[PDB]
Amino acid sequence: FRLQPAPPARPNRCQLFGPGSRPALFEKMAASAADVINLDLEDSVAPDDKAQARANIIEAINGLDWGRKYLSVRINGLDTPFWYRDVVDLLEQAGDRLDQIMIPKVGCAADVYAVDALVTAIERAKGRTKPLSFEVIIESAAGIAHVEEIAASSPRLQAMSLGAADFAASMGMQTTGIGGTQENYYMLHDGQKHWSDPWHWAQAAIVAACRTHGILPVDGPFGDFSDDEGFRAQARRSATLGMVGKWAIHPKQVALANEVFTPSETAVTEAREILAAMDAAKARGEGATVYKGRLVDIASIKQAEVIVRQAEM
Amino acid sequence: SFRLQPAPPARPNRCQLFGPGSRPALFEKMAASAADVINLDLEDSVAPDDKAQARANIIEAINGLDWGRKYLSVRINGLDTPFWYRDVVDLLEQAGDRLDQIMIPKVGCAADVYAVDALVTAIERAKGRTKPLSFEVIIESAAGIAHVEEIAASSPRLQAMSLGAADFAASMGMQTTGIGGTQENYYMLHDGQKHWSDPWHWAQAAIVAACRTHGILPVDGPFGDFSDDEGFRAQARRSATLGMVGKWAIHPKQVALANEVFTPSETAVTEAREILAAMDAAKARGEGATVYKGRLVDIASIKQAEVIVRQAEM
Amino acid sequence: SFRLQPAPPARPNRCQLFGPGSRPALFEKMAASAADVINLDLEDSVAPDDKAQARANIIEAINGLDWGRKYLSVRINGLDTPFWYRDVVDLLEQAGDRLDQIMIPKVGCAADVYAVDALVTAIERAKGRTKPLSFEVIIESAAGIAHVEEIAASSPRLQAMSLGAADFAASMGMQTTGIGGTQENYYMLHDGQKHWSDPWHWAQAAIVAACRTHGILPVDGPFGDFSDDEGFRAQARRSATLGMVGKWAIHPKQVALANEVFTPSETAVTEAREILAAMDAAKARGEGATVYKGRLVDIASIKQAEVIVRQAEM
Amino acid sequence: FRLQPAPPARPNRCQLFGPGSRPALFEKMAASAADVINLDLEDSVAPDDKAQARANIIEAINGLDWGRKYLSVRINGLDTPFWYRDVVDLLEQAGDRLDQIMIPKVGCAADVYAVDALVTAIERAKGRTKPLSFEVIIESAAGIAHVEEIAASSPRLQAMSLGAADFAASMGMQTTGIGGTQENYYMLHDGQKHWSDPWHWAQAAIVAACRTHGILPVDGPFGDFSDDEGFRAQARRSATLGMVGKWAIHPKQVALANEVFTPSETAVTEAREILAAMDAAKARGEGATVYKGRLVDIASIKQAEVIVRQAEM
Amino acid sequence: FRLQPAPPARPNRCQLFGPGSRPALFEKMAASAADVINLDLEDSVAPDDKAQARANIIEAINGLDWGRKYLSVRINGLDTPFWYRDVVDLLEQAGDRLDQIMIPKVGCAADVYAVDALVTAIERAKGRTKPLSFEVIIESAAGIAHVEEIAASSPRLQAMSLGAADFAASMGMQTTGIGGTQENYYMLHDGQKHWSDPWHWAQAAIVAACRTHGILPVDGPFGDFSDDEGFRAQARRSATLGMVGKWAIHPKQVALANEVFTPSETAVTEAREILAAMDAAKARGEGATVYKGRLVDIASIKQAEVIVRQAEM
Amino acid sequence: SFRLQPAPPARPNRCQLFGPGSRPALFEKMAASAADVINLDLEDSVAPDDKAQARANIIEAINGLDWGRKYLSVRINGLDTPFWYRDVVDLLEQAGDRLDQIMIPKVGCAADVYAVDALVTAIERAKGRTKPLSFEVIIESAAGIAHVEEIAASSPRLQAMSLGAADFAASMGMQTTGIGGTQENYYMLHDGQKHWSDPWHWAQAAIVAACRTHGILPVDGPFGDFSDDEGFRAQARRSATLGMVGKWAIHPKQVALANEVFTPSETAVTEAREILAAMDAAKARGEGATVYKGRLVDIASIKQAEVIVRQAEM
């Protein structure tokens, strides 16, 4: 009979991805302005190169200065022969600098449980001192259909990402784009077109599932790194719906993610003014008052606190 | 089973006018309004130190004022507070039979409603209350919307379910301090042009689906900007389109707007009756489908037209 | 488990042409159409008094007409009617093996499909029918959408699921008499100007997710205004974008429109093949990600490309 | 927030079965002392005779005087080609004297829902004035595993029987007997054998499921009609666990079922004395007191009423 | 991925019940050898005396020296008008000496949740320093049918009792006795009768539900307080199945319960010998060995520890 | 649906002979026994310090020894231990194709099995293993029996489920240090005389029901007192009566006992065939029920008789 479980307090404004098969770029990633680093063994690495990428990543975890980055590795999916070797090698060979693993293409709670079972055993066997957190990608029809059970699937779970590329493919969406506006998704009214959000339910359901269970909801990749305004629009929708951050799949997207997912000065100012107004009303024996011609009440305090919390971390 | 979905309560619910229990001067004004439902508030419009006085005010008003034919409801405090049980005990022990309903806020699962039901049922039996209260709830949290159907099925007392956009936004972590309505940062970019979309679509549609499945009235909640009448119309129109049957007024100005939108227009009713006539005429010719104004109407159109008619003849 | 989602039926389902069984004159025209699937109707396009005769007409048509390579389906009456059992018994006892499929309307739970499955299975065994029927259902009620996934997993016979916007709107209590498409009162107001949004988004997306999870074909239902080609294109395009693989035609003119929208454009197919080419080249360079026209493409892009190509090459 | 829903108040001490293919038995069954009559289309009727059995039963429903007896027909199972014809013909051809149908081999709630769907449609189409009630047999591993959902499967459902023959076969029990003691089910203690109840859970779980949902739990066939004392033991176990009656598969078993499932005057006497004792205790301001060296309290009232209710039936 | 959650470590060998309407007995109860005291507001107290009993109990909680007894109160059920008054008065008026509340006739998890909602609110409102634990009674068809969900229903939940009197009534069992042997529940073999356990499933299922979720399973009242040997048999059965204690409804039953539910010196000796034997085997590089002509292995260690654990508390 | 329960594996499973992997001298003796299934143990018969060596021994034994036609299984360590993952990896990366099965102990939910399935499936694919392993599990905890049905349905690989009375007793908190069999303190008192009852009844029956529902073989576990032949026979006889198809042998002597009890006697088979013959004759007379030795036999009796004959003809 308390409120929502609090999610992890750590910053998660941007998760910068890089293929494990390009170790020369690891230093640049560590030096970036991204909160989270995702070294990839999955869909940015060709099958013949996954063994080498695995070796590269283990070496980088043990050898590089990762500063204050939250260090995550995306392993291969449970429908592949690679996943078990990813987990075993990482947990048997990588030092304690590794923070987290990301599980792709999650379709049910049991998927997460399976990884948890293996990871827990190796951590115990090898006497690992820093237990890994988990993050997952909802990027299939099964994933979104079972989104709440997945959100509740492990005490290790800290974050859940939408993967619009795999999601579109799994859903059979007629597009080769990764996130963003869809040309053929619009409303016709009086001869004019009005574009609508083809991702609404997927993103909102993920947010609801995450907040219910104390997980961070995160927006995934936006493919068009040549389109800053397009990225801003996608990030803005996500931030509005309750997602706390977004992937960067290109160095330029890091600043854009940090821009959108850090509340503006004006937003923070209004938030504090609402808090001040409600405190004043409280002293007058009132639980509701008027702010700029609109209603504010006790619920507004919680809303204002959402803004301030994201700005103060 | 093997019948159509359960019919919801047939009472009017176009507008629910809210007022803080700590401002008893508003009570007679609320009683005089054109609102179908009255919600005397003990929760989020009332500061903590004023909750006891508000409870006393409300009980006295339930017993003392002429409430006409309005459906009288009280929003109690949430189950995550120390206030809720005293709200329920005092109301059920001291309020007369003019009280019709209580509103449970921040409902996260069916068991929340069951808990209030258990308490209310016991006191009604102990006091020999002749008019059993109905319940209404607010879906205004991540847990709430995630568990929306089980909540809709949670009690025989349950008559209505409202979306609470303010608490919903806070719960979901939505980057906004507004209450319902258009969100500036929720738009589609297309060829340099912005196209605003509905950031509340799923939540509202899911509430409607859960309610209609289990014979509950789906209702839209507060719209914060009482200076923005067209914004209210837009929000109310979206809700009415999705299947919600009414909307809160948190200011007297909003009652007229709610009644305007949630009462089907003459034009809409006229078309509905024309469609009903068209289908009856088609039925006589041995047809279950026909053409009306260049479009298809069939047996399903009868049910749709009856949705328009029903809300108008109430 | 530990495989990709089950593959849906490989058959074309770009358009399902509907016609009332009480109008046998339409039958040969439907057989001559360009529709992938034919739906002979016993339900909401047929008046109650004509349903018995419509049943007889349809049985004659199944046994007598040249249906070519059309997938032949019959929409029976709902389980909340006295007609449904006579539809199924007569069809399965009297129709020959040309019948491919039965469509069940107004499905609200998995048990509805199980019930029809139980009866159909018994008759097929009793009469030694050589070609067991496939099933398709309509999600067209609040209960249907609330229980969409369990319905999608309800039978090994199930091949397709349609959204029925007319009955869905009526069931949801949506204030409209239109069938699908833009709703005048569903828009966002931003700085004094309106921006229309999709009032069907969740229902459509949830149906697609349910279907793709369980190897079913998600299909868009009727668009009422057969006088509005561009409106049809808009609706069909939204559906195609979300992952639905076809759309009903309730008028001959809509068949060409459906085939057009649900067959990927040459431009779209061209880009897909270019992406596939780019990704193979990247593989050879020891890369699982590369750049295509200023955009990221990776291993997932291969799957997206294959969605386009697969649908174009059928 | 009330007590468990009340089951049907009609007597169900004994259900007398007879094959539909042996219509000479019908008038004898109608003249018996059995509360319920079950005319059989299923496992007592060979496949080639089922169509004629169906015709015989319809004739008997419409032509015989069944007095005050509750008239039921056991149809064929949902895994057979026969069931649909059974239901269609019964509801389209039989008059309103038919009270009930028994569905065999029920494995899940959806099985009962399927029959309900068909039955409801025909009753509406033909304007039948007396809607049928349902009863089912739990006689498979799936049946007992899903016993509660089956008990809640239909507002038509009035009774649930255990079918020990099919249950044994389904469970793979090493026996060819029908109910009763099993020679190989005993406890060995210091060289002595003590026979135990191999049907305990199945019977108890059926009672629990039924009472939870307002259904009558009933014991099924006892095969050895040459063994009166064996029948008595089986019937007594069932009555003790809470089952309200038992099948008769031979005329001799009817009197035995009525004997066991009608509470003895001794039992009724004790119950009334306990009831009187509790009333006297309440007058003294006591909720508990002593009866024959035993504790009795407010719970004892409910127990005594269980006895009396079945006696005044 | 650990062992099942440990139940509360406190002793619970005997729960001595007494009606709240007889406060003259409270001192005798406090001085008894019972681990837990249950002051009753329910079925041992007549309806008209429930108000006075409530006041009596609140006074006794605040006034009596309860030593080290675990102090619990059985409130009225959720299907009565009394329950809310019991809870409100107890939590608003009784001091911090109260340890626990017993909820009778529980039929689902939501029942426990309902009481938890009320209790939690009052504790917060009144600033109660010691949060109450909960215990419940499984004593209805719905209760046993939903026994696992009930066991998982609240973090407060510490114990679950079988209530054989209400259970028998709810199930429609033909008896007026409370627990123990049932005359009509026996197996007939070669003209000889062999009595079996009519309570087996109910008791075993309660134990399983409790041990799964870290709850103590407890046996309920035995009615015939004139029958020491009958009590011993009932207690021995419960102890064998895994119940950790039993109600006393008469002073004489306290010593009996303590006798049976404290492992005998012989039993403890064998346990320690098995532990010693297994330690010796481990030193020889063995995980299994022979003890008194039988197999003992790693599992035997856990079994021996069950014995020792109960003896050492 | 609409078919009888799924058939379990047809292979013999009358006895599963266990032996610790840390005693390789036993291996050839086990291979020469009359047991249908062999269980090489890495778990509770092997001390923690000896588990690595046991693993090496067993892998070498799988590849090196002639196991004839016996079904070869290995019991791995539990998912609550650090050993289990190394057990599975080494077995699947190093053992040849002679390995048939692995046994998972202390299973508490379906997800436990799914977890092992996930790991096993990946290694089989990575190594191109030609014969996919089957799974068997042990129900030997409170959670295990509480969730027995979901566990039985947890994997397509699952072929058998055993009751583990030692761990079950410990988990349930049973006051005993014995393994299976009569419990001295579990009896009914009646008129001064004691009558011992089955303290394992529900656990065994529920396991049988879960298995038969989902086409799994239910098996009885270890009986600890190998000095007590009649105790074993009694325990095995109870299990065979409830529907379990075999039993563990934890000592060579027990193999003969298990085969004795779990092979139907000639008397039992003769009666079964006589009943089948009687029912055949009844069918010819136009009867579905008749009399056999003063008792009723009908169509259900045919299935019962077939249960006896089937176990005899393995």
Ligand SMILES: CC(C)(COP(=O)(O)OP(=O)(O)OC[C@H]1O[C@@H](n2cnc3c(N)ncnc32)[C@H](O)[C@@H]1OP(=O)(O)O)[C@@H](O)C(=O)NCCC(=O)NCCS
């Ligand atoms: C999109 C991508 C393929 C483009 O690669 P590219 O053609 O070499 O990119 P650019 O030329 O525009 O890179 C600009 C600079 O940033 C570096 N850079 C490229 N990708 C980087 C990354 N992911 N992280 C950090 N630095 C990166 C480049 O090496 C180059 O450095 P320089 O200035 O010293 O020359 C590349 O950014 C990439 O691999 N993306 C991440 C893919 C991934 O991990 N996807 C996850 C699944 S969606």
Ligand SMILES: CC(C)(COP(=O)(O)OP(=O)(O)OC[C@H]1O[C@@H](n2cnc3c(N)ncnc32)[C@H](O)[C@@H]1OP(=O)(O)O)[C@@H](O)C(=O)NCCC(=O)NCCS
């Ligand atoms: C109980 C146990 C420790 C007794 O060992 P023991 O003292 O050597 O047994 P015995 O001396 O009576 O054995 C008799 C003979 O059978 C052999 N034997 C013992 N256990 C055997 C087994 N499990 N399989 C095959 N042969 C076995 C012995 O080697 C000996 O053979 P021999 O005549 O050539 O000398 C041993 O049987 C054992 O480990 N059992 C299996 C334990 C197990 O796997 N349990 C896990 C599941 S609960």
Ligand SMILES: O=C([O-])C(=O)[O-]
């Ligand atoms: O994982 C991804 O990059 C995706 O599918 O969106």
Ligand SMILES: O=C([O-])C(=O)[O-]
């Ligand atoms: O209940 C409310 O006012 C809200 O939070 O929207």
Ligand SMILES: O=C([O-])C(=O)[O-]
């Ligand atoms: O089935 C239909 O035509 C509908 O309701 O949309």
Ligand SMILES: O=C([O-])C(=O)[O-]
């Ligand atoms: O139905 C029956 O007779 C049975 O199988 O017990």
Ligand SMILES: O=C([O-])C(=O)[O-]
């Ligand atoms: O609570 C009790 O005493 C009972 O019903 O057994």
Ligand SMILES: O=C([O-])C(=O)[O-]
């Ligand atoms: O696994 C075992 O041997 C047991 O616990 O019975």
Ligand SMILES: [Mg+2]
């Ligand atoms: Mg992906």
Ligand SMILES: [Mg+2]
């Ligand atoms: Mg609110």
Ligand SMILES: [Mg+2]
């Ligand atoms: Mg329709």
Ligand SMILES: [Mg+2]
């Ligand atoms: Mg049978």
Ligand SMILES: [Mg+2]
């Ligand atoms: Mg009781």
Ligand SMILES: [Mg+2]
């Ligand atoms: Mg074990």
